[PDB]
Structure formats: C-alpha cells, structure tokens
C-alpha cells in the first residue's frame, strides 16, 4: 500500500496474508474454511495466515493454516487478468474471534463514489521497494468505469474496477495483490493490478468480486 | 535493471544469481570457489548459480552451487550500508569455461568518468515492479563524488560511490543488489542502494570494491 496508513491492530479481521515461506499475497476471509484470492496468487501449497498484523511479529493473535484446495476461476485469463479471482478451502475452520473474522460479499456491485478500504503487507512505495511489517491501511473510492477505461485503453473488463486516486501518491501496489477492497462492510473487490504505483492518472485496477458472487457459492458448496 | 538492455547470451560470465528457492541477489565469480555480493544479501543458506542467462530457463550451462562460508564484511553496518561485502565460498570449485568465467578485483580506484557495467535480475521497472527472466544489461558512468553526496547528504561514506544518470531512466534496482559493476574489465563496484529505481537526481549508490581488496584477499586466505 502506497500512502495508506497503518492499520488500529486487529481492525482488518478479514485480512489473511498467502504464505510460501514468505508473504506474497493478502486474501479475504469468507468464512471459517475459506479464502477469496486473486488467482495470479496461486501456488501448488499455501500457507494462510490470519489474525496478523506484523507479519514478521509473533504476537500471539496469530493462526497458521495450510491450503487444502487452491481453485482458480476456471476462466482464469492470465494474459488478460480477467477472471482473477481465486478460492482457497483451508485444510480445517479457524477459530473466528476479535482479530478473525470474515467479511460479507457484496449483495450489489457497489455505485462508483463508495469509499472503500484497502489493506495490505504489499509494496509501500511508489519507486523502488519497501516491503513493511505492519498491515497498512487506506482508504479510496471507486472510480467511474469511464476514468477506469480511459487509463487503461482497450485493457478494463467488464469484472475489473478501479479504485483510487487519478492524481496518485496512493495506491495498493505489488503485494497488496489477492488483497481486499471493503466498502459498507462488503468485499467488493481485489487487488488486482496497475501500471506502477501510485503514479498519477494509473488507478488501481481490482476484480469485481459483484460479479462472481453466484461462482464463489456454488464452488463453496461444491466442495 | 531500469532501463537496460538484454545481455548477450553468456557475456557477462561472471554473473551469478544468489538463489534462495528464488533468485534474490547477484554476485561476481572471483575464483573458483568465491563469489563477493553484499552483506545485506546474507541468508543461512544460498545456492549459487553460475551460467545463467534464463533465470527461469534451463538452457544447459547452468552450475548450481550451495554456498559453504558466508562471511559478511565484520564491520558491515545494516544501518548505513557502510562495509555491504560479503564473500561466499562455495561448497566445491565450478568448471570455469566460457560462461562461468571469473572477474578481477580493482588494481586501482577507477575514476569519474569511467564507464561501467552493470548486470542483473533485479526489477526493470521505475514504478511498480517486475521481475526479468533475461539477464540485463547497463553502460553507465561512475559521477564524482561530489554528486554522489550531492544527491544523498550524509548517507555517502568514502566506501560507496553512485554510478549513473543524474536525469534518471537508468539504474539498478532490487534485485540487482550484490551484483557486480566492472570496469575495463575490473569489478569496481556492487549494487547497494539508492531512493527508488531511474529516479532523476537519485543515482545508484554502490559498494567501492577497490576498498576492500586487502579484506577480501586476506579472507579467501584465511578460509
Ligand atoms: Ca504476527
Ligand atoms: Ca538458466
């Protein structure tokens, strides 16, 4: 997150940060056994790791749980980035409490003007790298499709918004990636990509979890 | 490296890729058995690939080599950088042919105004980041200390020196930390760090080798 803040401990419940021997992603929790994810952010094994705030801290709030099934949007468009969108069923329930908790999916494709929340362990520059250790927070609104296309000629599907700010200074950046985006208490995108960080007139491009909310049930259900 | 170019398959023989299970850092072969890096590229367990071109490619000159001694500079300072060397030793001698070849180590302090180069895996983008498979490739001039300072007050110690473009476009980035930048054919300096990547007015401060060539002697000596 590039200009965000960091985040009041444990106010962001539903942050889970993909684990491989280092944090690469953040995820959404959905429910007690599973996480919603981009499905760049697939790996053949995952560790999911909830009730974190310094990732590289035990605090003690912490749970450590591997993937059991990793399942990508079968029309997972990797050259594109349509479609990306991600679910992982974790091996066994984690214990929900004050620190982990889930996060409700959107019962409408929220209007553009919404302030939403956007957090992460991802890129907190706008040049170079800076990985941090505690969560950053930031809040942004949901652009209008036409701002949205009109930075991104010919490269926005109809599953992708933007969010953030056309003057730039802050973004979501790499990392943040799988990462949620919450407004009115909802999930209503994810951390999906843009051209840099933070650069003026490059929105952040996230996935309109809106429209696959009938997909993530019914693979929920499936599995 | 922003703004390079894609180096000639095995040009740059002495190039190495300090692999983690991922590449994170380069180095330079100076010997059969020793490779230099930075200090802040330290891990407990390093695999050492020579050969490489295609970091993600098998293309049959690859040499993979776990890393027996790792000794940082004992004055290596990780608040300032100051003393960032380290030297590997590797767990056996490589063959040295044609594209694992060694480099040598600075006869004298090369002056301003030299032209360098400077190779890596490292981030290629000014903004946001990504990640080559092609080893890259820079020409670029060792500036005056006075601009090295110029550009960071009192960060430059008598043992870093930037080389670049004060108009930015060009530069290291992460990723291409520990990697080598030889001059007429001579190892000079290795990525350190600057303010973000191709930044006007932040060139890429580096390791001064020539400072060091006792230490590093006296160390492959030693061990
Ligand atoms: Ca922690
Ligand atoms: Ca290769």
């Given at each position: 997150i590039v200009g965000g803040y960091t985040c009041?401990?444990?106010?962001?419940?539903?942050q889970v940060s993909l684990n491989s021997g280092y944090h690469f992603c953040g995820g959404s929790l959905?429910?007690?056994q599973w996480v919603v994810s981009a499905?760049?952010?697939?790996?053949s094994r995952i560790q999911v790791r909830l009730?974190?705030?310094?990732?590289?801290?035990?605090?003690?709030?912490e749970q450590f749980v591997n993937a059991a099934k990793i399942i990508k949007?079968?029309?997972?468009?990797?050259?594109?980035?349509?479609?990306?969108i991600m679910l992982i069923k974790l091996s066994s329930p984690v214990k929900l409490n004050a620190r982990v908790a889930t996060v409700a999916l959107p019962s409408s494709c929220a209007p553009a003007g919404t302030q939403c929340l956007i957090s992460g362990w991802?890129?907190?520059?706008?040049?170079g790298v800076n990985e941090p250790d505690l969560l950053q927070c930031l809040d942004a609104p949901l652009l209008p499709q036409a701002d949205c296309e009109a930075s991104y000629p010919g490269k926005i599907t109809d599953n992708m918004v933007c969010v953030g700010f056309?003057?730039?200074?802050?973004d979501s950046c790499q990392?943040?990636?799988?990462?949620p985006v919450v407004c009115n208490g909802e999930?209503?995108?994810?951390?999906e990509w843009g051209y840099?960080?933070?650069?003026?007139?490059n929105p952040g491009v996230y996935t309109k979890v809106c429209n696959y909310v009938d997909w993530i049930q019914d693979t929920i259900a499936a599995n």
């Open positions: 009041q401990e444990n106010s962001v419940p539903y959905i429910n007690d499905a760049h952010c697939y790996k009730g974190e705030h310094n990732i590289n801290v035990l605090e003690g709030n949007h079968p029309n997972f468009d990797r050259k594109t980035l349509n479609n990306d991802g890129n907190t520059l706008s040049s056309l003057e730039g200074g802050k990392g943040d990636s799988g990462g999930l209503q995108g994810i951390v840099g960080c933070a650069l003026p007139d």
